[PDB]
């Protein structure tokens, strides 16, 4: 079959580039920014400003936290649509929404496995969250999943939920208590000021990729950015020896 | 606030070492109707920063900084600037936390080095250690607590507490 | 950004902007450089906002009391007059515009409030505030009133407040004590209480502002008003046989109006500082430039010494300087504007009846004290 | 000293193991004997009306039931015990109530009470074994005086209160008073033969012990105000309101709305509200809809006697008047957790406030709205109504008997004498 030829072409394409064009793209993106205007003397004080009014203004602004990176500022979206022409990688019927259980575990699996991707340090677990009502008087999950949870709990006697076998499920619910709409503000949805729509990208795939990039972020949290070059010469300059100013996965160490 | 601003800036201008910031925690009294206790609470009084991440954090910080600029009237926001800014939101019951411990016992508390910071058990010192600070000092005064922070490692100088006692009542 | 090669000047709407425009037309005839004079509303609040971002006028005319605050934010350039030009203006006019040792804001004129009275309705104006209600009980019999002035601006209500005591900031040991504010002492409470009593007994209306009181005096409906030289002015049109005299005394002590120095400041962000210097020093602050401005709207006792012989020909200037003799030069410290706002609040809640005198002056004191603390 | 029969608690899974329970080297076992629960937790207050069944459901974490669950009412020395898990039952409550224990993981005791009265006006507690040993939870029950919550009448007609009370009450002094601008309220009529000058020959009160109901006819002059009906001494606040008006509204005799003041569902079934009424009001519009949570926003309009629907309830609802019985049916097909608010059921234009404020919540997984008990005898037919939601609507939902060895349906799909009602949606 022709899948092997396509995989060979993909390996051939990736071996040429390897690391330098992506690195150069990211560096170019960083270089253009921060060149508009530098104050160098502006100081933010707590005297003229007030913490209470700051909190109210922060609450008033929407969205408080940027759900996705702005497409107009940086062409992140171009890479996604670079070689994706419709290609329904969920090959079951679209509107993957309000379609309840009768959600088999194998319907994402078929396309994803074949992709020959990054090794599965991917948790590959989706935190489906259902907020039944705005007021909190409801069974605290969807009923179809809830009855299965009740059956497993009855097997386990449902004594203490604190000593869970896997703490990831308990933690992720605390981490994200919201759907792709942050606060349901009247003006949150009617916005026509971001001049590059995401072309209705699926929330679940974006969220999984985003949280795996947040695992990349927490591993990126280091005491010093340049451990190797710190003993030789340490100084403060508004210049960068490395344009990326960070490193990714280790090549051979 | 302006006079206290001047005196907090004066405190670090004559300082022998390189202190990153200075914060005056201010006493107040709220009437808790349940216990009937006029509880003393430390809160943000004033502050003076002197000084020397990923995309989402820096965009959040730059958004906050330009919101403040819009209020008063685009460089990157270092971890010390952001710790200084987020410290304005915190309040401290007397005895609770590092400034409340300094105030309640009228003593100087000197946390020098990231080991001391992480080993002290104060959450503010830990968050400061995460955000680049190496030295945190709380000195009790008559009307509040003077807190100094620095990214360098500084050992106990009596000259600092002397300056604090001189410039403040 | 301010356009290079021309001058933009802001001046208050009650001042001589057409005369200033004629001086600017003389500047345009001599140098080819155009001068645009504008008079926006709330310019003393709009100026620091646009000036902080590098915009605004090249030159601003205003009383000196705000300019030190403009000095603190870096909004004004340090001026460079030579000794010969400094010897052309009065020494106290230079003393009023000093902030932190440095000269700013070229002095234009000295202003003080006076009592303006209708000689036909009232040939003998009263010497005391206390006889104003009883006089007001007679003119209402003839369909007139005794006194109407702007109660919305605390500058005009300060002489009654300042008479029996009360002050802006305490001056001691060669410095100001900004935490010692005198808005709630016995004299200030007595003055504001007397004003509120004048309003309660229907001798004046709390809603009366500058335009209504000016229109009322220009139609012969009220026998007195309290204002400076810029009212003369179309009171000059009105042909009313008017006189200008001393403010009334209160509890045996004279009224103490703030004495203002109208001054010309140069924006630090202006690229036309030398052109502004040449315009202000060599054309405006001359006999003919000040004459041209005074013919539009009289400035009062201008700072130019050589015009003083002309000043002696106007007895209304003598009355203005007699009121100035019984008053005080305003401080120029940056907190004064917030001070004005607090006093602006203190009158309006008292005048309308929504707060008592004690509550309003207490609120002003807490406002100021919280601002320093 | 010793008990002949072993305690019914040994069911639950137990794990016999080596030193240290924090390391999982232990064998689970299940003792197969009999169930367990306890009594901790409760609704903290229940407001109920007459003729309406009251569920009472303590929560229950597992050392009890050899330990009978006893409901008692708290006055005097060592409060009289009403109900046990043991078969003892108080003589004043025979056939009136039924406790049902239920076991380990669905853990709850269910009191069901049929006809609440002012002999139950007070503190209740529901407790395991040994009453005098502090192992208890307390539950303030709240009771009587459903009434004509908003009365009219036309300015030359005759109106009538109908005022429920109880056996305390069956020998009493019932009161009708007009509310005035202070906490005192001056009595207008009282069954102790005393009647105000301002209402003589224009009122008549008549107690009726058997159905537990006073009637109060007003042939001449009530006056438009708030009106109060009560027991003796209406300062202890056991009163209810009537609000009467004739200020430019004109409506016949005593309109109503003594419906169930709670229903409890989950998205399996469809609720059917039933609200009563009176003569003049059958001509006017009737509506349910949910009043919005923000105070500023006015109440919206859902279904109506004139054929306005809501855009998400159109095929999903049915409203059905019945003028002789003065009743109104409301049928809401697809319950979902987007509907669990407070519900208004108004009988004029929204805004006029003449409505009972139902709550409609529960967290459960049974659902079934029906007349949960029925009465019939030999050779008669019966009927009931037994309902379905949108999800199970495609499947047939015929009526079936509650307890049987195998699944069977009482009524077949074929209709010979009566036809099943299946409002497709």
Instruction: Please tell me the distance from the alpha carbon of residue A16 to that of residue A23, in angstroms, as a whole number.
Output: 14
Element (DSSP H or E) covering residue C115: strand C114-118
Environment class of D105 (CB within 10 Å of its CB; exposed 0-12, middle 13-18, buried 19+): middle
Q: Do chains D and A touch (3 or more CB pairs under 8 A)?
A: yes
What is the distance between the alpha carbons of residues A247 and A245, in angstroms, rounded to a whole number? 7
Strand-pair partners of D97: D113
| D345 cis-preceded (ω within 30 degrees of 0) | no
A36 interfacial to chain B (CB closer than 8 Å)? yes
Spell out which residues of chain B touch residue C51, defining contact as CB-CB under 8 Å.
none
- CA atoms of D208 and D188, how far apart (whole Å): 19
Q: What is the DSSP letter of D89?
A: B
Fold of D159-241: Immunoglobulin-like (2.60.40)
Name the CA dihedral angle for D97, D102, D108, D113, rounded to a multiple of 10 degrees: -10
Cα C34 from Cα C25, distance rounded (Å):
7
Closest CA in chain A for residue D293: A135
C-alpha angle C334/C336/C337, rounded to 5°? 90
Categorise residue C10: left if φ over 0, alpha if ψ from -120 to 50, beta otherwise: beta
Q: How far apart are CA D165 and CA B142, in angstroms?
A: 68
Cα distances (Å, whole numbers) of residue B53 to A221, A223, A231, A234, A246: 7, 11, 22, 19, 9
Q: How far, in Å, CA of A8 to CA of A142, rounded?
A: 44
Distances from the Cα of C173 to the Cα of A172, C176, C185, angstroms: 65, 8, 22
Interface with chain A: mutation pick from D62, D340, D392, highest number of A CBs within 10 Å: D340
- Six-digit token string for C257: 């109006």
| Residues D337, A153: C-beta atoms closer than 8 Å | no
- Indicate the pairing of strand B144-150 with strand B135-140: antiparallel
Nearest to C105 by CA among C268, C300, C325, C299: C268
Token digits for B101? 């411990």
What are the sequence ranges of the domains in chain B? 2-52+79-167
CB-based contacts of B74, cutoff 8 Å, min separation 6: A34, A36, A37, B62, B65, B66
Determine how many CB atoms are found less than 10 A away from the CB of residue A213.
Answer: 13
- Which H or E element spans position B55? helix B55-72
Indicate the SS3 state at residue D161: strand
* Order of strands across the sheet that contains D327-332: D272-275, D327-332, D317-322
Does the distance separating the beta carbons of A220 and B76 come in below 8 Å?
no
Closest among D360, C349, B168 to A137, alpha carbons compared: D360
Q: How far apart are alpha carbons B17 and B152 in whole angstroms?
A: 9
Closest to D145 measured CA to CA, from D223, D51, D222 = D51
Spacing of C-alpha A138 from chain mean position: 29
- Between the CA atoms of C256, C258, C259 and C264, what dihedral angle is there, to the nearest 10 degrees? 180
Q: At what angle do helices B79-86 and B123-130 cross, to 10 degrees?
A: 150
Using a CB–CB cutoff of 8 Å, tell me whether A132 touches chain D. yes
Interchain CB contact of B67 with A (< 8 Å): yes
**Can you spell out the DSSP letters for D337-357?**
TT--SEEEEESSSTTS--S-E
> Distance between CA atoms of D162 and D185, rounded to whole angstroms?
20
Residue C38 burial (CB count, 10 A): 13
Whether chain A has a CB inside 8 Å of the CB on B131: the answer is no
D13: contact with A, CB 8 A cutoff: yes
Measured between alpha carbons, how far is D21 from D53 in angstroms, rounded to an integer? 47
CA distance C256 to C167: 10
CB-CB neighbors (< 8 A) of A46 in chain B: 44, 46-47, 88
At the top level of CATH, the class of D255-425 is mainly beta
Distance CA C363, CA C184 (A): 9
Contacts of C322 (CB under 8 A, 6+ apart): C246
In angstroms, how far apart are the furthest CA atoms of chain B? 49
Topology adopted by domain C7-111+259-329: D-Maltodextrin-Binding Protein; domain 2 (3.40.190)
Q: In this complex, which of A39, A45, A51 lies closest to B89 when CB atoms are compared?
A: A51
Based on its alpha-carbon atoms, the radius of gyration of chain C, rounded to whole angstroms, reads 21
| CATH superfamily membership of C114-256+335-372 | Periplasmic binding protein-like II (3.40.190.10)
Q: How many residues does chain A have?
A: 253
Q: Which residues of B touch A30 (CB under 8 A)?
A: none
Chain C contact partners (≥3 CB pairs within 8 A)? B
Please name the member of A137, A147, A157 whose beta carbon is closest to the beta carbon of D13: A157
The 3-state DSSP class for residue B161 equals helix
Question: Per this entry, what is the length of chain D?
Answer: 425
- Using CB atoms, pick whichever of B1, B3, B73 lies closest to residue C53: B73
CA nearest neighbour of D127 among D93, D99, D91 = D99
Is the CB of residue B3 less than 8 Å away from at least one CB of chain C?
Answer: yes
Query: Which two structure tokens, joined as six digits, stand for C240?
Result: 């009313």
Q: Rounded CA gap, B6 and C72, in Å?
A: 14
- Say if CB D104 and CB D10 are below 8 A apart: no
Distances (CA, A) of C322 to A27, C91, D22: 74, 18, 95
Q: Do A66 and B2 touch (CB under 8 A)?
A: no
In this complex, is the C-beta atom of A153 within 8 Å of any C-beta atom belonging to chain D?
yes
Residue C9: which of C25, C21, C22 has the closest Cα? C21
Per the CB < 8 A criterion, the answer to whether A244 and A20 are in contact is no
Cα angle vertex C186, ends C185, C187, to 5°? 95
Phi and psi dihedrals of B18, rounded to 5? -95, 95
Q: Give dist(CA C203, CA C135) in Å, integer.
A: 10
Rounded CA Rg of chain D? 26
Provide the shortest C-alpha distance from residue A14 to chain B (in Å): 26
Nearest to B68 among A44, A55, A236 (CB): A44
Do C77 and C268 touch, CB atoms closer than 8 A? yes
Cβ contacts of B109 within 8 Å, gap of 6 or more: B98, B101, B102, B137, B138
Closest Cβ–Cβ partner in B2, B65, B89 for A44: B65
CATH fold of B2-52+79-167 reads Beta-Lactamase (3.30.450)
Cα–Cα nearest to D47, from D127, D150, D144 = D144
CA dist B143 and B168 (Å) reads: 9
DSSP C78: P
Residue C347 has phi, psi (to 5 degrees) of: -75, -45
DSSP calls for D180-242: -SSS-EEEEEETTTEE-GGGTTS-EEE--TTTTEEEEEESS---SB-EEEESS-SSS--EEE-
d(CA D19, CA A245): 53
Do D42 and D136 form a contact (C-beta atoms < 8 A)? no
Q: Looking up tokens 């993909």, which residue turns up?
A: A10
Cβ(C304)–Cβ(C115) under 8 Å? no
Q: List CB contacts (< 8 A) between B60 and chain A.
A: 65-66
CB within 8 Å: B89 and A55: yes
Phi, psi (deg, nearest 5) at residue A24 = -65, -40
Chain C residue numbers with beta carbons less than 8 Å from the beta carbon of B3 are 178, 372
**Residue with tokens 């005794």, as numbered in its chain:** C146
In the block, residue with structure tokens 């006079």: B3
Instruction: Give which of A38, A47, A63 to mutate to test B binding, by max B Cβ within 10 Å.
Output: A47
Range list for CATH 2.60.40.10 in chain D? 1-143, 159-241, 255-425
The candidate with the shortest Cα–Cα distance to C229, out of C167, C288, C286, C290, is C290
Instruction: List, in sequence order, every residue forming a beta bridge with D185; answer none if it has no partner.
Output: D179
Q: What is the DSSP letter of C250?
A: B
Check whether A250 is labelled as a binding-site residue.
no
CB-CB contact of D217 with D160 (8 Å): yes
Residues 57-76 of B with CB under 8 A from C: 73
Whether A147 and D365 lie within 8 Å, measured CB to CB: yes
Enumerate long-range contacts of A24-28, CB under 8 Å, 24 or more apart: A26/A244, A27/A243, A27/A244
Contact C244, C115 (CB under 8 A): yes
Q: What is d(CA A242, CA A68) in angstroms, rounded to the nearest whole number? A: 26
Q: Diameter of chain C by CA atoms?
A: 61
Give A-chain residues touching D267 at CB under 8 angstroms: 143
Contacts of B76 in chain A (CB under 8 A): 34
The angle subtended at Cα C29 by Cα C24 and Cα C34, nearest 5°, is: 50
Closest CA to A108 of A96, A120, A118: A96
CB C147 within 8 A of CB C204: yes
Characterize D382-406 residue by residue with b for buried, 16 or more Cβ atoms within 10 angstroms of its Cβ, and e for exposed. Answer: eeeebbbbbeebeeebebeeeeeee
The Cα–Cα gap between D12 and D36 comes to: 8
A142/A132 Cα distance (integer angstroms): 8
Q: Which of C303, C288, C302, C274 lies closest to C86, judged by CA? A: C303
Nominal resolution in Å?
10.4
Please, which residues have CB within 8 angstroms of residue D75's CB and are 6 or more apart in sequence? Answer: D122, D123
Q: Are D350 and D297 in contact (CB under 8 A)?
A: no
| Cβ contact A47–B52 (<8 Å) | no
Nearest-CA distance D337 → chain A (Å) = 5
User: Does A129 contact chain D (CB < 8 Å)?
Assistant: no
Letter string b/e over residues D292-311, b meaning 16 or more CB atoms within 10 A of that residue's CB: eeeeeeebeebbebeeebee
D338 part of contact set with chain A, CB < 8 Å:
yes
Residue recorded with tokens 């404020």: D357
Establish whether chain D is in contact with chain C, requiring a minimum of 3 CB pairs below 8 angstroms.
no
Q: How far is B156 from chain A (nearest CA, A)?
A: 25
- Closest by CA position to A196, among listed A70, A66, A33, A29: A70
Q: Could you give the angle at which helices C357-372 and C336-352 cross, rounded to 10 degrees?
A: 160
Interface contact A133, partner D, CB < 8 A = yes
Q: Any residues with CB less than 8 A from the CB of D231 and at least 6 apart, and which?
A: D165, D169, D172, D173, D174, D175, D238, D239
Task: Nearest by CB to A39, from B46, B68, B75: name it.
Answer: B75
Q: Mark yes or no for CB contact A132/D337 under 8 Å.
A: yes
| CA neighbor of C289 nearest in space, from C1, C22, C2 | C22
3-state secondary structure of D141: strand
Task: State the structure-solving technique.
Answer: cryo-EM
Listed in sequence order, the residues at least 6 apart from D96 whose beta carbon sits closer than 8 Å to its beta carbon are D113, D114, D115
**Residue numbers in A near D12 (CB within 8 A):** 157
Tallying the residues shown for chain C, one arrives at 373
Instruction: Name the CATH architecture for the domain at D1-143.
Output: Sandwich (2.60)
Residues contacting residue A251 through CB under 8 Å, at least 6 positions apart: none
User: Which of D175, D229, D221, D227 has its CA nearest to residue D200?
Assistant: D221
SS (H, E, C) chain A: CCHHHHHHHHHHHHHHHCCHHHHHHHHHHHHHCCCCCCCCCCCCCCCCCCHHHHHHHHHHCCCCCCCCCCCCCCCHHHHHCCCCCCCCCCCCCCCCCCCCCCCCCCCCHHHHHHCCCCCCCCCCCCCCCCCCCCCCCCCCCCHHHHHHHHHHHHHHCCCCCCCCCCHHHHHHHHHCCCCCCCCCCCCCCCCCCCCCCCCCCCHHHHHHHHHHHHHHHHHHCCCCCCCCCCCCCCCCCCCCCCCCCCCCCCCCC
What the block records as the tokens of D236 is 């202890």
Q: What is the DSSP letter of D365?
A: S
Nearest CA in chain A to B44: A46
Structure tokens at D156: 């030359």
What would the two tokens of residue D65 be? Answer: 């039931």
Residues of C within an 8 Å Cβ radius of B: 49, 52-53, 178, 371-373
Separation between Cα atoms, residue C205 and residue C200, nearest integer Å: 9
Structure tokens at D77: 């020395």
Is residue D389 a contact partner of residue D332, using CB atoms and an 8 Å limit? no
Touch between chain C and chain B (3+ CB pairs, < 8 Å)?
yes
Nearest to D372 by CA among D385, D390, D391: D385
- Residues B114-142 as b/e (b if ≥16 CB within 10 A, e otherwise) read bebbeebebebbeebbebbbbbbbbbbbe
Where do the DSSP E strands lie in D24-122? 26-29, 45-47, 54-56, 70-73, 81-83, 97-102, 108-113
C114-256+335-372 matches C7-111+259-329 in CATH topology: yes
Please answer yes or no on whether A49 and B71 come within 8 Å at the CB atom.
Answer: yes
d(CA C340, CA C368): 10
Beta carbon pairs, B and C, within 8 Å: 9
| CA A131/CA A180 separation, integer angstroms | 12
Kindly identify which residue of chain B lies nearest to residue C178, measuring between CA atoms: B3
Query: Cβ(C224)–Cβ(C131) under 8 Å?
Result: no
* DSSP code string of D379-424: T----------STTTSS------SS-SS---SS-SS-SSS------
Asked whether A224 and A102 are in contact (CB, 8 A), the reply is no
Cα–Cα distance, D369 to D270 (Å, whole number):
7
Residues 6+ apart with CB under 8 A from A234: none
Q: Which helix (H) or strand (E) holds D319?
A: strand D317-322
Count Cβ atoms below 10 Å from residue B94 Cβ, excluding itself: 15
- Chains within contact range of chain A (3+ C-beta pairs < 8 Å): B, D
The H helix count followed by the E strand count for chain C is 16, 15
């Amino acid at each position: 079959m022709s899948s092997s030829m396509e995989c060979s072409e993909f390996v051939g394409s990736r071996r040429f580039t390897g690391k330098k064009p992506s690195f150069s793209q990211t560096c170019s993106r960083l270089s253009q920014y921060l060149k508009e205007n530098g104050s160098f003397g502006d100081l933010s004080l707590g005297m003229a400003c007030k913490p209470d009014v700051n909190g109210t203004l922060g609450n008033s602004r929407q969205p408080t936290t940027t759900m996705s990176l702005f497409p107009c500022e940086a062409s992140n979206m171009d890479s996604m649509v670079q070689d994706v022409k419709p290609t329904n990688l969920f090959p079951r019927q679209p509107s993957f929404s309000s379609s309840s259980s009768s959600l088999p575990k194998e319907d994402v699996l078929k396309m994803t496995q074949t992709t020959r991707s990054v090794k599965p340090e991917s948790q590959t677990a989706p935190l489906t969250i259902f907020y039944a009502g705005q007021v909190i008087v409801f069974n605290d999950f969807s009923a179809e999943k809830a009855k299965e949870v009740i059956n497993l709990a009855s097997k386990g006697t449902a004594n203490s939920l604190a000593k869970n076998q896997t703490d990831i499920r308990s933690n992720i619910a605390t981490i994200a208590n919201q759907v792709p709409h942050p606060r349901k503000t009247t003006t949150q949805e009617p916005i026509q000021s971001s001049p590059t729509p995401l072309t209705e990208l699926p929330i679940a795939r974006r969220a999984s990729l985003h949280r795996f990039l947040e695992k990349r972020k927490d591993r990126v949290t280091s005491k010093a950015p340049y451990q190797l070059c710190d003993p030789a010469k340490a100084s403060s300059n508004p210049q960068t020896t490395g344009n990326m100013s960070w490193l990714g996965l280790a090549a051979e160490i | 606030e302006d006079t206290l601003q001047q005196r907090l800036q004066a405190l670090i201008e004559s300082a022998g070492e390189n202190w990153t910031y200075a914060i005056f925690w201010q006493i107040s009294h709220d009437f808790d109707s349940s216990t009937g206790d006029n509880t003393v609470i430390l809160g943000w009084g004033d502050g003076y920063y002197k000084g020397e991440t990923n995309t989402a954090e820096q965009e959040h910080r730059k958004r906050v900084i330009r919101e403040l600029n819009s209020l008063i009237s685009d460089e990157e926001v270092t971890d010390t600037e952001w710790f200084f800014l987020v410290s304005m939101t915190q309040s401290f019951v007397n005895g609770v936390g590092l400034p409340g411990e300094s105030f309640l016992n009228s003593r100087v508390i000197w946390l020098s080095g990231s080991g001391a910071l992480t080993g002290s058990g104060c959450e503010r010192a830990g968050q400061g250690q995460i955000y680049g600070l190496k030295t945190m000092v709380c000195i009790a005064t008559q009307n509040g607590v003077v807190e100094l922070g620095s990214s360098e490692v500084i050992s106990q100088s009596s000259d600092l507490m002397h300056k604090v006692n001189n410039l403040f009542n | 950004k301010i356009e290079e090669g021309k001058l933009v000047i802001w001046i208050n709407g009650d001042k001589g902007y057409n005369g200033l425009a004629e001086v600017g037309k003389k500047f345009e005839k001599d140098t080819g450089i155009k001068v645009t004079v504008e008079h926006p509303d709330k310019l003393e609040e709009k100026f620091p906002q646009v000036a902080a971002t590098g915009d605004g006028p090249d030159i601003i005319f205003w009383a000196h009391d705000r300019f030190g605050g403009y000095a603190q934010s870096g909004l004004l350039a340090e001026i460079t007059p030579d000794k010969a030009f400094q010897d052309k203006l009065y020494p106290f006019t230079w003393d009023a515009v000093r902030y932190n040792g440095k000269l700013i804001a070229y002095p234009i004129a000295v202003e003080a409030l006076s009592l303006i009275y209708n000689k036909d309705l009232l040939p003998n104006p009263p010497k005391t505030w206390e006889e104003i209600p009883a006089l007001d009980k007679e003119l209402k019999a003839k369909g007139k009133s005794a006194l109407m002035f702007n109660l919305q601006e605390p500058y005009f209500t300060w002489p009654l407040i300042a008479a029996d005591g009360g002050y802006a900031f305490k001056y001691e040991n060669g410095k100001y004590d900004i935490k010692d504010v005198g808005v709630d002492n016995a004299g200030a409470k007595a003055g504001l209480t007397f004003l509120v009593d004048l309003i309660k007994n229907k001798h004046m209306n709390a809603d009366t502002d500058y335009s209504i009181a000016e229109a009322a005096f220009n139609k012969g409906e009220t026998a007195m008003t309290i204002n400076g030289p810029w009212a003369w002015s179309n009171i000059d049109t009105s042909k009313v046989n008017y006189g200008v005299t001393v403010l009334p005394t209160f509890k045996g002590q004279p009224s103490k109006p703030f004495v203002g120095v109208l001054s010309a400041g140069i924006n630090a962000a202006s690229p036309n500082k030398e052109l502004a210097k040449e315009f202000l020093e060599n054309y405006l602050l001359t006999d003919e430039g000040l004459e041209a401005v005074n013919k539009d709207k009289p400035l009062g006792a201008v700072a130019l010494k050589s015009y003083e012989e002309e000043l002696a020909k106007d007895p209304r200037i003598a009355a203005t300087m007699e009121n100035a003799q019984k008053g005080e030069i305003m401080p120029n410290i940056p907190q004064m504007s917030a001070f004005w706002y607090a006093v602006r609040t203190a009158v309006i809640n008292a005048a309308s009846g929504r707060q008592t005198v004690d509550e309003a002056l207490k609120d002003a004191q807490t406002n100021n004290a919280a601002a320093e603390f | 000293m010793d008990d002949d029969n072993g305690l019914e608690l040994s069911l639950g899974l137990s794990c016999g193991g080596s030193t240290g329970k924090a390391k999982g080297n232990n064998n689970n076992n299940a003792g197969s004997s009999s169930e367990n629960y306890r009594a901790e937790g409760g609704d903290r207050s229940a407001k109920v009306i007459d003729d309406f069944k009251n569920f009472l459901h303590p929560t229950s974490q597992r050392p009890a039931e050899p330990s009978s669950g006893s409901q008692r009412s708290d006055s005097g020395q060592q409060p009289p015990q009403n109900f046990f898990n043991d078969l003892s039952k108080a003589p004043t409550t025979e056939a009136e109530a039924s406790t049902k224990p239920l076991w380990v993981e669905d853990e709850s005791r269910k009191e069901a009470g049929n006809k609440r009265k002012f002999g139950f006006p007070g503190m209740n507690d529901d407790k395991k074994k040994e009453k005098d040993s502090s192992h208890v939870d307390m539950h303030e029950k709240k009771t009587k005086a459903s009434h004509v919550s908003t009365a009219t009448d036309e300015g030359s007609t005759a109106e009538n209160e109908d005022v429920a009370e109880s056996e305390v009450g069956g020998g009493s002094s019932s009161n009708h008073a007009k509310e005035v601008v202070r906490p005192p309220t001056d009595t207008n009529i009282v069954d102790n033969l005393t009647g105000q000058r301002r209402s003589n020959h224009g009122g008549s009160g008549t107690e009726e012990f058997t159905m537990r109901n006073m009637s109060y006819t007003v042939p001449f002059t009530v006056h438009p105000q708030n009106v109060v009906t009560s027991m003796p001494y209406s300062l202890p606040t056991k009163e209810s309101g009537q609000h009467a008006a004739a200020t430019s509204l004109l409506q016949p005799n005593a309109n109503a709305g003594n419906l169930p003041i709670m229903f409890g569902y989950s998205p399996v079934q469809l609720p059917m509200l039933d609200k009563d009424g009176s003569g003049g009001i059958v001509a006017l519009s009737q509506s349910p809809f949910a009043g919005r949570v923000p105070s500023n926003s006015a109440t919206a309009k859902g279904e109506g006697k004139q054929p306005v629907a809501e855009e998400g309830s159109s095929e999903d609802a049915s409203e059905r008047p019945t003028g002789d019985n003065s009743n109104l049916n409301t049928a809401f097909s697809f319950d979902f957790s987007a509907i669990k608010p407070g519900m208004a059921a108004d009988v004029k234009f929204g805004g006029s406030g003449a409505r009972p404020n139902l709550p409609w919540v529960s967290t459960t997984g049974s659902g079934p709205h029906g007349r949960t008990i029925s009465g019939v005898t030999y050779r008669y037919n019966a009927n009931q109504i037994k309902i379905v939601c949108a999800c199970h609507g495609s499947h047939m939902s015929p009526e079936e008997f509650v307890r049987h060895a195998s699944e069977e349906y009482v009524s077949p799909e074929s209709s010979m004498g009566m036809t099943a009602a299946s409002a497709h949606t």
